[PDB]
Ligand binder design. Structure first.
Ligand SMILES: Nc1ncnc2c1ncn2[C@@H]1O[C@H](COP(=O)(O)OP(=O)(O)O)[C@@H](O)[C@H]1O
Ligand SMILES: Nc1ncnc2c1ncn2[C@@H]1O[C@H](COP(=O)(O)OP(=O)(O)O)[C@@H](O)[C@H]1O
Lengths: 605, 143, 145
């Protein structure tokens, strides 16, 4: 019976019926979860013969629906949240009652007052439901947390039970009872504990720093930790940028208790923990294609000329360079990935370099690469330390366990790394970049943690000509300045000239003018579906084309120019497959092969 | 020596920079006495400071005010160029490109980037933002 | 009070400003404000003005954004007063940082990641650029950096 039901609580549950009933969108949502479990419950049982339980609730709704219940949750989470949860549990028990738990709420929002950043926080905002965003570091090691106990007892058979209430259980405070760990049942029989019957729930606590881009000019950062349980655990790695919404607690006694300075350790409970995107960090594409978008793609896929339009869509502000833009798309797509059975994998993605006199937009192009790229990290010259490396950070952090802190190229995995002033970078690093690019993996033997960890990143680099403007006239070699294998590793070496002409000049002038006085939005959405759906494989339409082409290249160009190897061939295949992705075709084609041919030609000539 | 080639081994620095002013001091007794006498005035008897102050009474700005003014203009209004000014500047830059190419037919050692044009633009908007006007004018650029 | 410089101000300042916008010699009187002490060098003298006032700033799609405002090189043999002139700009400009370096003395010249000895973690250590953001930065010995 506990403390028996009270019409405070009674009203707070009952009033939260009509909503959620209106807006009804949640009522079936719960059902859906049930469904998804049921099916999967049918999958384990019959075939060889799961989801978290929390359901998001928009704060938008309450304003229309209930003002007081709104203002109440925000202002007093302690009193309104647990009855709400109670209600939704009751409902969830109603939906499918027959076959045989918290059922927590998210609280999306529609924030807030109460929108605040970890720099500006407490003590007016104390014990209210807060939205706090920022870098996540240092995170923490996940530990299972013990809740119920079970014991066997001989000779009387039976079994037992126990419950454990932490300081952080529920929300509101409760008169604490330590249960010991029951052993030595009375009468005096021993108790052999048993596992796997006794439940556990995982536990994690991550600290959140204030946003470094939204940081003050300079000052020390100041962070606040957050506790996360069960379904919320492990969602975010350290270094992500994260919006955490949840209660803010005073928990603990502040020295007032033991009578004999600092006080009242405070932390945030739950709750939503959204991973989100910000430039250079933490995914996030994501993206939502709805009903209509995917249809737009599907319609647009059939049109034969689309590739050129797409390739023009990148450059509102940049002339010509249609070939280069074409390239950047062909990097965004990137030749699937192929991992042979019991053998090494052939590199999927395509790497690019740009060399030309300054004003070539080479440094200007790359930022626009970055924005729509869906990741990745940018790196400029030096740069470093370690670039992509974990650096094998000494020491401890914490308690003395040696752990790794991932550099760029690792953190940039499945993404587009930018490199500016690629020539300036110390050879010491380049030595590592060889290992990164083709081989596709990073290897750290340093002290230390000894591991081979995977960075499969795609790469762009812009690098000034050797000395002055001399690139244009200067020889096919001695111009690059960064021999040798690197020149090969890069799939495409594109050269651009700043050499001047009056006509071209005028044609520059007008567009520059109008600038100061296929839409980018739909571009990346166009891209993600293209990326995970679907890989075109390979077809005997094309192969003879790229073989003819390749052999041509070696035989004739080795008289013309350099370098040419099997590497070039690999690149041919990657380009073919990429342009296949652009075509959305489930297959590789001959036309595509001809395209790859074309761009690799303008690369060479 | 060639005008560039000064900074390290590379002129690229000078390429990034919009407005490069080489300053020269040559000795002209007229001008040298001008500058000198001016400095003698500067130290004390503060006669120059005074002159500034009557410039303040009559015309000139206290520079404590100038600041507040700059903040003002900077936040309030964002200027935009006029079309005839634009085409004007097109003519400007194509004459630059053409003529100075012709100059560099001889491989005359020195430069021209569209970045420089963009600079010229930013000057026009800057000065437009002086007059505080939401719109540019031709003369306005002619300076 | 910088950074967090207050953008709000009293009415009469708008009044007297809008009274200054009405001057034909406005440009020309401003160009006389900057160097009461510094004699001549009128092109530089005007260039400072057009620098402080910022310029066209465009957020136009795609993510590319063009910038303002420009750059100025005073380079030349001493007696140019440029190194003094910079102190002046530093005074006038609403938010400004004079750093001649190499950075100095403790201050790095550029954005730098340094770690908080306690709590470890990471923070921006400070430098010319970051602390000076959204305004004027004054550099000397620019070839010596
Ligand atoms: N094709 C182009 N169209 C318009 N503007 C361009 C073009 N190429 C370069 N620019 C101008 O050049 C500047 C970028 O210089 P950039 O070439 O990136 O220097 P870097 O050689 O260091 O990369 C920008 O101001 C941009 O307006
Ligand atoms: N036009 C001028 N008016 C007043 N003082 C000047 C002028 N030109 C130079 N000076 C003097 O020159 C000094 C500044 O030296 P500066 O040329 O900045 O050295 P550097 O160029 O090596 O930094 C100041 O002491 C100043 O008194």
């Amino acid at each position: 019976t506990f403390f028996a039901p009270d019409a405070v609580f009674g009203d707070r549950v009952r009033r939260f019926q009509e909503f959620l009933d209106t807006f009804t969108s949640y009522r079936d949502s719960v059902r859906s979860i049930q469904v998804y479990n049921s099916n999967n419950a049918a999958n384990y049982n019959d075939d060889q013969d799961i989801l978290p339980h929390r359901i998001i609730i928009s704060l938008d709704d309450l304003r229309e629906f209930d003002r007081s219940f709104w203002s109440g949750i925000l202002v007093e989470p302690a009193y309104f949240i647990p009855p709400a949860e109670k209600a939704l549990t009751d409902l969830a028990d109603s939906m499918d009652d027959v076959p045989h738990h918290p059922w927590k709420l998210s609280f999306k929002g529609s924030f807030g007052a109460h929108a605040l950043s970890p720099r500006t926080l407490t003590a007016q905002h104390l014990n209210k439901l807060v939205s706090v965003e920022g870098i996540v570091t240092k995170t923490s090691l996940v530990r299972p947390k013990l809740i119920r106990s079970v014991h066997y007892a001989a000779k009387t058979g039976r079994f037992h039970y126990r419950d454990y209430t932490d300081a952080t259980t529920t929300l509101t405070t409760r008169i604490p009872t330590p249960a010991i760990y029951p052993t030595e049942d009375t009468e005096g029989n021993k108790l052999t504990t048993e596992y796997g019957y006794s439940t556990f729930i995982d536990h994690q606590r991550i600290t959140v720093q204030e946003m470094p881009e939204m940081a003050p000019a300079g000052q020390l950062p100041r962070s606040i930790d957050v506790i996360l349980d069960d379904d919320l655990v492990d969602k975010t790695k350290p270094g992500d940028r994260v919006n955490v919404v949840g209660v803010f607690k005073s928990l603990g006694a502040g020295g007032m208790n033991q009578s004999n300075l600092i006080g009242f350790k405070t932390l945030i409970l739950g709750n939503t923990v959204y991973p989100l995107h910000a430039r250079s960090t933490g995914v996030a594409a994501r993206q939502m294609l709805t009903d209509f978008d995917i249809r737009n793609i599907n319609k647009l896929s059939k049109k034969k000329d689309i590739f050129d339009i797409l390739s023009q869509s990148l450059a509102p502000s940049i002339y010509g360079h249609d070939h280069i833009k074409k390239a950047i798309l062909l990097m965004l797509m990137g030749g699937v990935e192929k991992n042979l059975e019991n053998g090494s994998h052939l590199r999927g993605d395509i790497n690019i370099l740009m060399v030309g006199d300054p004003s070539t937009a080479k440094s200007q192009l790359l930022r626009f690469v970055l924005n729509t790229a869906s990741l990745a990290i940018a790196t400029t010259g030096r740069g470093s330390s370690g670039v992509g490396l974990t650096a094998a950070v000494t020491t401890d952090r914490e308690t003395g366990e040696r752990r790794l802190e991932a550099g760029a190229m690792v953190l940039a995995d499945r993404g587009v790394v930018c490199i500016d002033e690629f020539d300036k970078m110390t050879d010491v690093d380049r030595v590592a970049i060889h290992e990164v690019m083709e081989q596709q993996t990073v290897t750290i033997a340093k002290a230390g943690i000894h591991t081979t960890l995977n960075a499969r990143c795609s790469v762009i680099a812009a690098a000034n000509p050797v000395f002055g403007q001399y690139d244009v006239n200067r020889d096919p070699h001695q111009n690059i300045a960064l021999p040798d294998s690197l020149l090969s590793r890069f799939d495409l070496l594109f050269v651009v000239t700043d050499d001047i002409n009056e006509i071209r000049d005028r044609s520059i002038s007008e567009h520059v003018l109008r600038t100061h006085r296929v839409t980018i939005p739909f571009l990346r959405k166009y891209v993600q579906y293209a990326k995970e759906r679907v890989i075109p494989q390979l077809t005997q339409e094309a192969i003879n084309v790229i073989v003819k082409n390749y052999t041509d290249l070696r035989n004739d160009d080795n008289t013309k120019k350099s370098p040419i190897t099997a590497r070039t061939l690999e690149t041919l295949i990657r380009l073919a497959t990429a342009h296949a992705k652009v075509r959305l075709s489930k297959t590789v084609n001959k036309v595509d092969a001809k395209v790859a041919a074309n761009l690799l030609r303008f690369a060479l000539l | 020596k060639s005008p560039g080639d000064n900074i390290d081994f590379q002129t690229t620095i000078l390429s990034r920079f919009d407005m490069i002013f080489i300053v020269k001091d040559d000795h002209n007794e007229e001008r040298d006495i001008s500058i000198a006498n001016h400095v003698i005035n500067i130290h004390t008897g503060n006669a120059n400071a005074m002159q500034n102050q009557q410039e303040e009474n009559g015309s000139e700005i206290s520079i404590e005010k100038m600041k507040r003014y700059i903040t003002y203009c900077r936040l309030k209004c964002a200027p935009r160029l006029s079309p005839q000014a634009a085409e004007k500047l097109s003519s400007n830059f194509v004459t630059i490109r053409k003529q100075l190419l012709i100059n560099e037919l001889e491989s005359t050692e020195r430069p021209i980037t569209i970045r420089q044009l963009e600079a010229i633009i930013r000057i026009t908007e800057s000065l437009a933002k002086l007059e505080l006007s939401p719109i540019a004018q031709e003369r306005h650029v002619d300076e | 009070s910088i950074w967090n410089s207050v953008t709000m101000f009293t009415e009469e300042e708008e009044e007297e400003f809008l009274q200054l916008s009405r001057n034909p010699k406005l440009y020309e009187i401003l160009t006389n404000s900057i160097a009461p002490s510094i004699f001549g060098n009128e092109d530089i003298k005007k260039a400072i003005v057009c620098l402080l006032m910022g310029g066209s700033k465009k957020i136009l799609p795609d993510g590319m954004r063009l910038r303002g405002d420009i750059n100025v090189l005073l380079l030349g043999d001493p007696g140019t007063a440029k190194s003094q002139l910079l102190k002046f700009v530093e005074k006038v400009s609403p938010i400004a940082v004079y750093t001649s370096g190499k950075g100095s003395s403790a201050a790095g010249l550029t954005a730098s990641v340094q770690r908080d000895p306690m709590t470890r973690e990471f923070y921006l250590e400070g430098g010319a650029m970051v602390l000076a953001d959204g305004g004027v930065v004054c550099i000397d010995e620019f070839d010596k950096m």
